[PDB]
Amino acid sequence: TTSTGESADPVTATVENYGGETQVQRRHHTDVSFILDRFVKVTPKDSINVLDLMQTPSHTLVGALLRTATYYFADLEVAVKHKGDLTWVPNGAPVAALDNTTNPTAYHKAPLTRLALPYTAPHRVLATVYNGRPLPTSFNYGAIKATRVTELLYRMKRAETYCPRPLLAVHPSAARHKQKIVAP
C-alpha cells in the first residue's frame, strides 16, 4: 500500500493485502473515562493540601495518561486518611476559610474518609500545560485541611481529554527492556 506520506492523512493498511483477515477488536480497557477512573497516590502535606491533579507523579498510570492531553475535564473523588476534622473549600476561596466548620467538614471516622467533589473551577476546561513551568492559580479543585493528613488519593470521574500530547516509555539500554515478570 503506497501513498504520499507528506499528506499526513491517516493511512492504515491491513493484513488482507497479502491475504490475511482482520480480526475483532475490543478496546474497552483503553477508553479514556474507563482507564482514568481509579485512585492514585499523592504525597500529602501535613495540614493544607490544595487539590490539584498535577501533583500526581508523572510516571504513575493515572499521572502519565493525564499529562498526555492539553485540556482535560473531570469531577474528583478523594480518599483521605487524617487526624481531626477534614475541612474542604471550593475553588478560589480564601485560605482563611479552611478554619470554619461551616464549610464542608468530615468528622473523623476510621479507617479513612471518602468524598465526592464537583468540578469547581471557573474555566470551562482545565489544562495540563499552560503557555504564559507554573500553572495559573485558578487551576485547582480547592483545598483540604486537617490536623494532619496521612494519605491522599485522587479519583477522576467523567474524564474528558482534548488535544493529545507525547507519551513516553522507558528507553532501554539493550535491544529490549527486560523486567522480571510474575511467575510461579
Partner: protein
Amino acid sequence: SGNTGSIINNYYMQQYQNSMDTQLGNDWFSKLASSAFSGLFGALLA
C-alpha cells in the same frame, strides 16, 4: 460511562453526586481514524 458497577439507581440525585453540565448555542479523533485509507493505490495483479 466510566468504571461503575451499580445495577441499581444511585441513592443521591444526579444533581448532587455530579456537577451538572450546561449547553451553549470519540468526536474528532475517532472520526479521524475511521477515515483511514485501507485500499491499494495502484492496480492489483493476481
